[PDB]
Each structure stands twice: as C-alpha cells, then as structure tokens.
Design an enzyme around this catalytic site. Structure first.
Site, PDB file in Angstrom:
ATOM      1  N   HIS A  62     -33.849 -68.857 -41.089  1.00 46.99           N
ATOM      2  CA  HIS A  62     -33.670 -70.499 -41.408  1.00 46.99           C
ATOM      3  C   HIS A  62     -32.224 -70.506 -40.315  1.00 46.99           C
ATOM      4  O   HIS A  62     -31.788 -71.520 -40.034  1.00 46.99           O
ATOM      5  CB  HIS A  62     -33.904 -71.157 -42.005  1.00 46.99           C
ATOM      6  CG  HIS A  62     -35.241 -71.225 -43.152  1.00 46.99           C
ATOM      7  ND1 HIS A  62     -36.285 -71.708 -42.644  1.00 46.99           N
ATOM      8  CD2 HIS A  62     -36.390 -70.406 -43.663  1.00 46.99           C
ATOM      9  CE1 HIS A  62     -37.825 -72.161 -43.546  1.00 46.99           C
ATOM     10  NE2 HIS A  62     -37.293 -70.817 -43.731  1.00 46.99           N
ATOM     11  N   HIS A  92     -23.829 -68.734 -45.269  1.00 45.39           N
ATOM     12  CA  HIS A  92     -24.798 -68.960 -44.418  1.00 45.39           C
ATOM     13  C   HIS A  92     -24.058 -70.003 -43.586  1.00 45.39           C
ATOM     14  O   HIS A  92     -23.059 -70.494 -43.932  1.00 45.39           O
ATOM     15  CB  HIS A  92     -26.102 -68.656 -44.667  1.00 45.39           C
ATOM     16  CG  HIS A  92     -26.430 -69.716 -45.171  1.00 45.39           C
ATOM     17  ND1 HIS A  92     -26.558 -70.281 -47.074  1.00 45.39           N
ATOM     18  CD2 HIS A  92     -26.568 -71.611 -45.359  1.00 45.39           C
ATOM     19  CE1 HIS A  92     -26.469 -71.376 -47.378  1.00 45.39           C
ATOM     20  NE2 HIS A  92     -26.186 -71.959 -46.799  1.00 45.39           N
ATOM     21  N   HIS A  94     -24.879 -73.863 -41.556  1.00 49.38           N
ATOM     22  CA  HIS A  94     -25.937 -74.704 -40.714  1.00 49.38           C
ATOM     23  C   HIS A  94     -25.483 -75.089 -38.911  1.00 49.38           C
ATOM     24  O   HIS A  94     -24.227 -75.488 -39.237  1.00 49.38           O
ATOM     25  CB  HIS A  94     -26.092 -76.033 -41.140  1.00 49.38           C
ATOM     26  CG  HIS A  94     -26.860 -75.519 -42.603  1.00 49.38           C
ATOM     27  ND1 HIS A  94     -28.351 -75.301 -42.812  1.00 49.38           N
ATOM     28  CD2 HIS A  94     -26.234 -75.066 -44.136  1.00 49.38           C
ATOM     29  CE1 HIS A  94     -28.554 -75.148 -44.253  1.00 49.38           C
ATOM     30  NE2 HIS A  94     -27.000 -74.427 -44.509  1.00 49.38           N
ATOM     31  N   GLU A 104     -24.433 -80.693 -41.961  1.00 50.54           N
ATOM     32  CA  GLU A 104     -25.385 -81.110 -42.831  1.00 50.54           C
ATOM     33  C   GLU A 104     -24.386 -82.524 -43.579  1.00 50.54           C
ATOM     34  O   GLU A 104     -25.714 -83.459 -44.033  1.00 50.54           O
ATOM     35  CB  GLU A 104     -25.472 -80.010 -44.314  1.00 50.54           C
ATOM     36  CG  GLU A 104     -26.477 -79.194 -43.654  1.00 50.54           C
ATOM     37  CD  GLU A 104     -27.317 -78.312 -44.440  1.00 50.54           C
ATOM     38  OE1 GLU A 104     -27.332 -78.226 -45.516  1.00 50.54           O
ATOM     39  OE2 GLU A 104     -28.465 -78.505 -43.933  1.00 50.54           O
ATOM     40  N   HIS A 117     -21.532 -72.591 -45.665  1.00 53.31           N
ATOM     41  CA  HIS A 117     -21.632 -72.799 -47.254  1.00 53.31           C
ATOM     42  C   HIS A 117     -21.555 -71.474 -47.701  1.00 53.31           C
ATOM     43  O   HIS A 117     -22.311 -70.283 -47.683  1.00 53.31           O
ATOM     44  CB  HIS A 117     -23.033 -73.331 -47.467  1.00 53.31           C
ATOM     45  CG  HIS A 117     -23.320 -74.612 -47.356  1.00 53.31           C
ATOM     46  ND1 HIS A 117     -25.120 -75.286 -46.434  1.00 53.31           N
ATOM     47  CD2 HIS A 117     -22.717 -75.375 -46.646  1.00 53.31           C
ATOM     48  CE1 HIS A 117     -24.562 -76.133 -46.436  1.00 53.31           C
ATOM     49  NE2 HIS A 117     -22.864 -76.357 -46.938  1.00 53.31           N
ATOM     50  N   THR A 196     -29.903 -77.672 -50.290  1.00 52.03           N
ATOM     51  CA  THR A 196     -30.362 -78.744 -48.687  1.00 52.03           C
ATOM     52  C   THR A 196     -31.095 -78.212 -47.630  1.00 52.03           C
ATOM     53  O   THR A 196     -31.814 -78.664 -47.280  1.00 52.03           O
ATOM     54  CB  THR A 196     -29.238 -78.936 -47.596  1.00 52.03           C
ATOM     55  OG1 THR A 196     -29.307 -77.380 -47.380  1.00 52.03           O
ATOM     56  CG2 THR A 196     -27.612 -78.698 -48.415  1.00 52.03           C
ATOM     57  N   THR A 197     -32.353 -76.949 -48.819  1.00 49.18           N
ATOM     58  CA  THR A 197     -33.198 -76.837 -48.185  1.00 49.18           C
ATOM     59  C   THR A 197     -34.781 -76.252 -49.125  1.00 49.18           C
ATOM     60  O   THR A 197     -33.682 -76.271 -50.290  1.00 49.18           O
ATOM     61  CB  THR A 197     -33.475 -74.828 -47.587  1.00 49.18           C
ATOM     62  OG1 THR A 197     -33.134 -73.961 -48.554  1.00 49.18           O
ATOM     63  CG2 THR A 197     -32.096 -75.097 -46.319  1.00 49.18           C
TER      64      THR A 197
HETATM   65  C1  LIG Z   1     -30.281 -71.561 -44.508  1.00 52.51           C
HETATM   66  O1  LIG Z   1     -31.593 -70.584 -45.626  1.00 52.51           O
HETATM   67  C2  LIG Z   1     -31.481 -70.022 -46.728  1.00 52.51           C
HETATM   68  C3  LIG Z   1     -30.216 -69.991 -47.624  1.00 52.51           C
HETATM   69  C4  LIG Z   1     -29.938 -69.646 -48.250  1.00 52.51           C
HETATM   70  C5  LIG Z   1     -31.299 -69.163 -49.177  1.00 52.51           C
HETATM   71  N1  LIG Z   1     -31.100 -68.829 -50.603  1.00 52.51           N
HETATM   72  C6  LIG Z   1     -31.265 -67.647 -50.863  1.00 52.51           C
HETATM   73  O2  LIG Z   1     -31.708 -66.883 -50.366  1.00 52.51           O
HETATM   74  C7  LIG Z   1     -31.595 -66.710 -52.445  1.00 52.51           C
HETATM   75  C8  LIG Z   1     -31.256 -65.857 -53.056  1.00 52.51           C
HETATM   76 SI1  LIG Z   1     -31.036 -63.968 -52.350  1.00 52.51          SI
HETATM   77  C9  LIG Z   1     -31.172 -63.150 -54.261  1.00 52.51           C
HETATM   78  C10 LIG Z   1     -32.570 -63.102 -51.453  1.00 52.51           C
HETATM   79  C11 LIG Z   1     -29.301 -63.175 -51.999  1.00 52.51           C
HETATM   80  C12 LIG Z   1     -30.616 -69.668 -52.021  1.00 52.51           C
HETATM   81  C13 LIG Z   1     -32.668 -70.497 -52.208  1.00 52.51           C
HETATM   82  O3  LIG Z   1     -33.512 -70.218 -51.948  1.00 52.51           O
HETATM   83  N2  LIG Z   1     -32.722 -70.592 -53.810  1.00 52.51           N
HETATM   84  C14 LIG Z   1     -33.330 -70.587 -54.743  1.00 52.51           C
HETATM   85  C15 LIG Z   1     -34.106 -69.741 -55.217  1.00 52.51           C
HETATM   86  C16 LIG Z   1     -34.707 -70.053 -55.939  1.00 52.51           C
HETATM   87  C17 LIG Z   1     -35.024 -68.670 -57.293  1.00 52.51           C
HETATM   88  C18 LIG Z   1     -34.983 -67.710 -56.387  1.00 52.51           C
HETATM   89  C19 LIG Z   1     -33.700 -67.771 -55.312  1.00 52.51           C
HETATM   90  C20 LIG Z   1     -33.606 -68.346 -54.984  1.00 52.51           C
HETATM   91  C21 LIG Z   1     -30.046 -70.846 -51.210  1.00 52.51           C
HETATM   92  C22 LIG Z   1     -28.774 -71.019 -51.761  1.00 52.51           C
HETATM   93  C23 LIG Z   1     -28.326 -71.863 -50.569  1.00 52.51           C
HETATM   94  C24 LIG Z   1     -28.397 -72.899 -50.119  1.00 52.51           C
HETATM   95  S1  LIG Z   1     -27.290 -74.268 -49.517  1.00 52.51           S
HETATM   96  N3  LIG Z   1     -27.652 -75.144 -47.962  1.00 52.51           N
HETATM   97  O4  LIG Z   1     -26.266 -73.640 -49.629  1.00 52.51           O
HETATM   98  O5  LIG Z   1     -27.715 -75.999 -50.159  1.00 52.51           O
HETATM   99  C25 LIG Z   1     -30.298 -73.185 -49.690  1.00 52.51           C
HETATM  100  C26 LIG Z   1     -30.665 -72.036 -50.755  1.00 52.51           C
HETATM  101  C27 LIG Z   1     -32.154 -69.524 -49.050  1.00 52.51           C
HETATM  102  C28 LIG Z   1     -32.260 -70.027 -47.319  1.00 52.51           C
HETATM  103 CL1  LIG Z   1     -34.276 -71.180 -46.679  1.00 52.51          CL
HETATM  104 ZN   LIG Z   2     -26.318 -74.487 -46.587  1.00 48.22          ZN
END
Ligand SMILES: COc1ccc(N(C(=O)C#C[Si](C)(C)C)[C@H](C(=O)NCc2ccccc2)c2ccc(S(N)(=O)=O)cc2)cc1Cl
Ligand SMILES: [Zn+2]
Length: 258
Positions: A62, A92, A94, A104, A117, A196-197
């Site tokens: 993503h 990360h 976008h 976003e 972000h 936002t995902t």
């Molecule tokens: C750009 O795409 C991204 C970016 C971040 C992430 N995130 C995580 O992978 C995490 C963690 Si970890 C323990 C594997 C290091 C966050 C995320 O997915 N949060 C949900 C979740 C629920 C339960 C357990 C773990 C995670 C998440 C955080 C912030 C946003 S945002 N765009 O800033 O709103 C989105 C998702 C996912 C995607 Cl698809």
């Molecule tokens: Zn983000």
C-alpha cells in the site's frame, strides 16, 4: 480480491468489508481554513524525537513504512490536544501519480503532492493493537509535501526505495532521524478521526501541520517507481495510494494559531 486503490478495490468499495467506512469520524477531511477555530487553550505541541530508534523499511503493498523501536519512550509526541504520552511506531507517506494530487487531507480543497503520517500510540493502552480499539488510542502527525526544493532529510529514504520495490520486501533502516522531515513551524489543525486505510478504526487524534515541506520532483518521482505488486507479478506502479476527503459530520477542526 482484498482492498487497495484500484478501480475495482479502491476507497468507494471499502465500506463493503469495513462498514465503519461510512461512520461518524472518518478521515481524511477537507480543512476549511475559514471554519476552523483558533483554540487558545491548545498547549504547544511537543515533538521529542532525539532518541528515535529506526529499525526497518517495508513495502507493505500500500505504501512504504519506516518502523521504530516503540518498546520504550524514545520518540514521543505530547502536548497540543493530547492527554499523556504517544510513542512513535512508524511513518509512511501517501502520494500521487501527478504533483497536483496525492495528499489525503486537503486545505480549502487544495491537494498537495503527498502527505507524511507519523503514527504514534497512547502508552496508557500498553500496545498498539490495544490502542487502536480506543477513541484516543492514536495521534497521527500529518505533514504535507509540495514539489520544489529537495528535502535533504528525506534523501536517505529515497535512496533505499530501490531495495524494497515490491510488496513484502524490507531492508535494514537504522539511525534515520525523523526530525529531518519536519517543517520549521509546528502550527497545526486538529480534529478527531480515523485510520485512512482499512480497518478505518475511529481511534485517531489528527494533528495536521499548516506548513508543508518541500521535496524535489526527483524525490517524488522515486516514490512513484515503487510497486504495489509482489516480485514476479505484473508491475503496477505504487501511485495514488490516498483516500479522498470524507464528510466532516458533527466535528470541529481547531487551529493552534491565529
Ligand atoms: C500505508 O498503509 C499502512 C500504514 C500503516 C498501517 N498500520 C500498521 O501497519 C501497523 C502496525 Si505494526 C505493529 C505491523 C508496526 C496501521 C494499522 O493498520 N492499524 C490497524 C491495526 C489493527 C490492529 C493491529 C494492528 C494494526 C495504520 C496506522 C496509520 C494509518 S494512517 N494512514 O496514518 O491513518 C493507517 C494504518 C497499515 C497500512 Cl495498510
Ligand atoms: Zn497514512
């Protein structure tokens, strides 16, 4: 058939697997600069990144994620609208296919080329997975990118992107200092919103900085050479990985500045 940013699996489809997509506190939003109210009670923002410990950079299919050691209070966000201490876990971006889109959040409907972000979680909940179940679990620091002069503090990120071209690839990414990605001013807007995902959880205090950072055309071009696909699969450029603005509903965007 999992979620993404294509015609068949993009943001207009997400509500079918994630019904909270049509919820009361979804992100991002348009920031109407004439409706946001200065709130003189907002404390100044405290960005404490001097002990930040970066570990790794990952293409997750993503975006790309730079991950930090969040097993202690080493890089924290405090103050502003926040109660307590939020630990940096990752950042990360976008971005767009063109310089006229990619962010976003928007500001009076203006779209920036990209958005950074910096994701933090509330240490009163003990781990990130518990924090995303709470309405005050996360604080995301959002920073707009415009195309102009290069950002020197971004270049270490740009130069590793060749090594994580495809989904699932990671690389060691130690000793990276996220202070090099901040603008001069910490003036901000804040509102309650969401990831936002998918899974679009309503757990975020958004803090969006007013002042964008400048990156070069060559810097964003290198973001756009990433792939959404895995190695050996048909190439799909990682571009336009942004969710558009969602309805503000019953929310107020507050400004830290007059
Ligand atoms: C750009 O795409 C991204 C970016 C971040 C992430 N995130 C995580 O992978 C995490 C963690 Si970890 C323990 C594997 C290091 C966050 C995320 O997915 N949060 C949900 C979740 C629920 C339960 C357990 C773990 C995670 C998440 C955080 C912030 C946003 S945002 N765009 O800033 O709103 C989105 C998702 C996912 C995607 Cl698809
Ligand atoms: Zn983000």
């Amino acid at each position: 058939h999992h979620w993404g940013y294509g015609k068949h699996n993009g943001p207009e489809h997400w509500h079918k697997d994630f019904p909270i997509a049509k919820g009361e506190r979804q992100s991002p939003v348009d920031i109407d600069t004439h409706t946001a109210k200065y709130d003189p009670s907002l404390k100044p923002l405290s960005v404490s990144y001097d002990q930040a410990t970066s570990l790794r950079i990952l293409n997750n299919g993503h975006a790309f994620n730079v991950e930090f050691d969040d097993s202690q209070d080493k890089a924290v966000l405090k103050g502003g609208p926040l109660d307590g201490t939020y630990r940096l876990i990752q950042f990360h971006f976008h971005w767009g296919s063109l310089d006229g889109q990619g962010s976003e959040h928007t500001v009076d409907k203006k779209k920036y080329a990209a958005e950074l972000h910096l994701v933090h979680w509330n240490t009163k909940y003990g781990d990130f997975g518990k924090a995303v179940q709470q309405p005050d679990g996360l604080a995301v620091l959002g920073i707009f990118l415009k195309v102009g002069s290069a950002k020197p503090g971004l270049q270490k990120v740009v130069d590793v992107l060749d090594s994580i071209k495809t989904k699932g690839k990671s690389a060691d990414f130690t000793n990276f200092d996220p202070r090099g990605l901040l603008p001069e001013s910490l003036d901000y807007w804040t509102y309650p919103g969401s990831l936002t995902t998918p899974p679009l959880l309503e757990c975020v205090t958004w803090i969006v900085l007013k002042e964008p950072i400048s990156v070069s055309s060559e810097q964003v071009l290198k973001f756009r050479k990433l792939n959404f696909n895995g190695e050996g699969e048909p190439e799909e450029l990682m571009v336009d990985n942004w969710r558009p603005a969602q309805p503000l509903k019953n929310r107020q965007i507050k400004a830290s500045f007059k």
